[PDB]
Amino acid sequence: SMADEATRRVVSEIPVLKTNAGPRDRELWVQRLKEEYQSLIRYVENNKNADNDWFRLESNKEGTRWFGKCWYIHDLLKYEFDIEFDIPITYPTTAPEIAVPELDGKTAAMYRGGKIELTDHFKPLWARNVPKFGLAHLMALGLGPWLAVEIPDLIQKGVIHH
């Protein structure tokens, strides 16, 4: 399957996650957060080695709210956007909704509050992999390809400026 190979190419060097736990699941949630941080930090270190260090994320104390920044390079100019999301109670079965608040309402591929709209193919891909995919995979398979379409479009349309 061409979709299966495309998924493995993009995510193969990201540690897989294991624990089916969300924010209310106590010691299993603490364990899931260790998996999330181990997977994110390996992804960031691979990104640095590939000259594609394109985001930073931190969480609140309980790991229920995430925020930081992404960078997108277009014609050698670097654009920064603040990003944030809440962990759904039903995570990791349900994918979190990444918001880019400063782009709220500026593209059709987005809901109110700047919640990005991923393709229909992302949700079944996530679903079929639960609970192996985590926040690293959401960035690599979700926000990453969203920026590569939407940011060039918004620059060419003059809606965002460096």
Query: Taking the mean position of all CA atoms in its chain, how far away is CA 5?
Result: 20
Query: Taking the mean position of all CA atoms in its chain, how far away is CA 114?
Result: 14
Q: Pairing mode, if any, of strands 65-74 and 55-59? A: antiparallel
How far is it, in rounded angstroms, from Cα 69 to Cα 84?
A: 8
Alpha-carbon separation of residue 62 from 79, 91, 158 (angstroms): 30, 14, 40
Q: How many CB atoms lie within 10 A of CB 82?
A: 14
Q: How many CB atoms lie within 10 A of CB 134?
A: 28
**For residue 19, what are its two tokens?**
């624990």
User: Length of the chain, please?
Assistant: 162
Domains in the chain, ordered, with CATH? 2-156 (3.10.110.10)
How far is it, in rounded angstroms, from Cα 151 to Cα 64?
A: 28
Alpha-carbon separation of residue 34 from 38, 44, 69, 75, 157 (angstroms): 6, 15, 21, 37, 42
Choose among 3, 2, 17: nearest CA to 138. Answer: 17
Q: How many CB atoms lie within 10 A of CB 104?
A: 14
Q: Report yes or no: 19 and 35 within 8 Å, Cβ to Cβ.
A: yes
